[PDB]
Design brief:
Subcellular location (chain B): Nucleus, Nucleolus
Largest sheet of chain F: none
Radius of gyration of chain D: 13 Å
Number of helices of chain F: 2
Order of helices and strands of chain F: HH
Shape of chain D: globular
Number of helices of chain D: 5
Function (chain B): Required for pre-18S rRNA processing. May bind microtubules.
Protein name (chain B): Nucleolar protein 58
Strand order of the largest sheet of chain D: 1-4-2-3
Family (chain B): Belongs to the NOP5/NOP56 family.
Organism (chain B): Chaetomium thermophilum (strain DSM 1495 / CBS 144.50 / IMI 039719)
Shape of chain F: flat
Chains: A mainly alpha (53), D alpha+beta (121), E mainly alpha (363), F mainly alpha (34)
Oligomer: part of a larger assembly
């Protein structure tokens, strides 16, 4: 099996976690105006996005 | 192990990594679970 | 949706690294070994390097 | 198998291991597969012996590549224990590399020795 | 500093408290809580917390009803330890020791640690019974509760047996059984103290397989190290060392081999005897003593490893034929030759069978 | 029988007191070492 999709795959995992982190904090503020306490009593962005939904 | 994978069911293809896990984790617990330096005990009077 | 794409990308890279180097997966795991593969570039070019490297 | 430069037990192995021991006494000797690999990749290496008694031989199959790249002669002896006490290590040395300097009779012995290795390959 | 030494010995002898710094620093010790939370805590509160835990342990087992009647009674909130005559402190240490033998199996559970935390925070078992409390937490010497014990434990009321724990009290980390076993080799005071515990919990049928396996482990590696010490090669020294080794270990094995109702410690003593005949070159009369007692302390549940010990003992015995009672109970073994073939697949059985069949010629 | 003590220590290193194999099996490990 081939290794170029290993190196591109983990590069896409790095940019994936980066862009998901900035988009995650983006919904932290972007809902944080209407309801500020959710980021304080909820640190995690995954459960944050689920409870915003 | 990566040299074995790179120059040649999966528990015969993975025949180096399991031996290195057993030796390397056994080696871990013999490193960590070690006694401290031997110290004298003194009584109430310094005896 | 990007969190779900993180989950199935992680299962992709885990199963793929199990198919490419099972010795690595049964030492340190797909992510860390995949990042070693990504640093040196490839599997033979990781194998040409000594243990201190 | 993959040991196509197999050294012959009629005293070519013996001259290899003897020159291993003399280079060990002149400190011209990088022992073990990793330090051998460092000497070949850094290009200090003048000759390199491996051991075909390796239990998985894949763990020393990687250095004939970089020895073909650096154009240094490699040859296999059939016992890592004989290579190990040929070095003087008290463990099994699996692959050894031996360098040279500007002026030594050891460098002359390396020259004649890889002349014989060139008669193999 | 003669008066300083005599008053220092009075102060380390002093089992009570007389200033408020030591009421607060004495009431501060606890397994569960923190010091700042444990200082300002009355005894009805701790009795509520614990006796919730002892309700739980009284659901989980059944032999705790008399300790509901005495130790975890509603009246035992108001029993100061240091205003009690020595007959009362002796009887209370009897009930404390029997309760602690009883608890010592379930000790990884929070109801057990709640009940033990009432014994510590009122009866001060960490200040009056440290040999039995170190002897009961000492099998669980890897869990963190043993390190909370090593942080409430008074450093100079600890038996000289157990004083190897001093750098482990000093730096709060659990000790290894390398250290436990090493001081069990050098101090016979320690190795007897473990075996005085384990045999005391088995006369009242309160054993558990972590206690059995822990004790048999320490006797195993400890008697290995002792034999490696006691070897000298000088003939009278190794004779005298063999006698000293038999005088140290002797009575422990002499009850453990015969203790039929605890087949665990019966098998552990089989194990140490097998180590002892294997590595230690003991005399033929000693080995006939081990074989005859092994033969007497005999069970259906300990048939199969006891036969292996007969093969070891008979194999390292220098004389040729066996002696009497061994041949009689091996007659009473049901599947003799088949069991000895299954043993002979992994051991050597031929000197045992030779001593048997030669004794049958001599019957 | 010469047996280095570290192999019997290796019999008693893992699975500390609880979760150890039962001592019929541990005794088979010990007597099989001897």
């Amino acid at each position: 099996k081939v290794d170029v999709m290993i190196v591109h795959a983990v590069a896409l995992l790095d940019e994936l976690d980066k862009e998901l982190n900035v988009m995650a904090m983006r919904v932290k503020e972007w809902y944080g105006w209407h309801f500020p306490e959710l980021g304080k009593i909820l640190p995690d962005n995954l459960s944050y996005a689920r409870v915003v939904l | 192990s990566v040299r074995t994978d790179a120059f040649e069911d999966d528990e015969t293809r993975a025949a180096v990594g399991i031996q290195a896990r057993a030796k390397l984790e056994n080696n871990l617990r013999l490193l960590e679970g070690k006694p401290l330096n031997k110290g004298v005990a003194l009584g109430p009077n310094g005896i | 949706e990007r969190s779900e794409y993180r989950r199935q990308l992680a299962e992709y890279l885990q199963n793929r690294m199990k198919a490419i180097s099972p010795n690595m997966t049964e030492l340190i795991g797909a992510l860390v070994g995949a990042r070693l593969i990504a640093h040196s570039g490839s599997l033979v070019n990781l194998a040409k390097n000594p243990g201190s490297t | 198998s993959a040991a196509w430069p197999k050294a012959e037990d009629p005293a070519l192995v013996q001259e290899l291991l003897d020159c291993v021991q003399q280079a060990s006494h002149y400190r011209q000797l990088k022992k073990g597969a990793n330090e051998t690999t460092k000497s070949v990749n850094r290009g200090t290496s003048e000759l390199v012996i491996l051991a075909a008694d390796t239990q998985p031989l894949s763990i020393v199959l990687h250095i004939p590549l970089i020895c073909e790249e650096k154009n240094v002669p490699y040859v296999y002896v059939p016992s890592k224990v004989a290579l190990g006490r040929a070095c003087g290590v008290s463990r099994a040395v699996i692959a050894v590399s031996l360098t040279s300097n500007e002026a030594s009779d050891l460098n002359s012995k390396i020259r004649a020795l890889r002349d014989k290795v060139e008669r193999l390959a | 500093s003669s008066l300083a030494q005599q008053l220092a010995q009075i102060a380390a002898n002093s089992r009570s408290s007389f200033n408020v710094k030591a009421l607060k620093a004495s009431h501060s010790k606890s397994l569960i809580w923190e010091p700042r939370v444990a200082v300002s805590q009355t005894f009805a509160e701790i009795y509520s917390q614990c006796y919730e835990g002892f309700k739980e342990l009284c659901h989980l087992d059944s032999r705790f009803v008399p300790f509901d009647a005495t130790l975890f009674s509603a009246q035992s909130q108001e029993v100061d330890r240091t205003q009690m005559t020595a007959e009362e402190n002796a009887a209370l240490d009897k009930r404390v020791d029997s309760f602690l033998h009883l608890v010592g199996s379930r000790l990884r559970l929070m109801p057990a640690i709640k009940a033990v935390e009432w014994l510590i925070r009122r009866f001060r078992i960490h200040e009056f019974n440290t040999g039995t409390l170190l002897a009961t937490f000492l099998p669980y010497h890897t869990i963190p509760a043993f390190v909370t014990l090593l942080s409430i434990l008074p450093v100079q009321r600890i038996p000289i047996e157990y004083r190897f724990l001093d750098p482990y009290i000093k730096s709060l980390t659990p000790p290894p059984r390398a250290a436990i076993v090493q001081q069990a080799t050098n101090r016979p005071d320690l190795l007897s103290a473990i075996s005085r515990y384990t045999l005391d919990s088995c006369r009242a049928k309160q054993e558990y397989p972590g206690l059995i396996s822990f004790w048999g482990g320490i006797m195993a590696e400890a008697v290995n190290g002792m034999i490696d010490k006691m070897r000298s090669g000088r003939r009278a020294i190794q004779l005298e060392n063999d006698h000293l080794l038999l005088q140290q270990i002797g009575p422990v094995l002499s009850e453990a081999m015969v203790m039929k109702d605890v087949p665990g410690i019966q098998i552990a003593s089989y194990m140490v005897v097998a180590i002892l005949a294997a590595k230690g070159s003991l005399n033929d009369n000693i080995l006939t003593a081990f074989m005859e007692q092994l033969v007497h302390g005999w069970t259906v549940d300990t048939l199969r490893p006891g036969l292996v010990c007969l093969t070891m003992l008979a194999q390292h015995r220098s004389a040729k034929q066996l002696s009497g009672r061994v041949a009689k109970a091996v007659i009473k073994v049901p599947d003799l030759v088949s069991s000895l073939r299954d043993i002979s697949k992994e051991h050597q059985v031929d000197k045992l069978a030779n001593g048997l069949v030669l004794a049958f010629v001599d019957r | 029988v010469v047996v280095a003590p570290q192999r019997l220590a290796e019999i008693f290193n893992a699975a500390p007191a609880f979760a150890m194999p039962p001592i019929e099996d541990v005794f088979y490990q010990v007597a099989s070492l001897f």
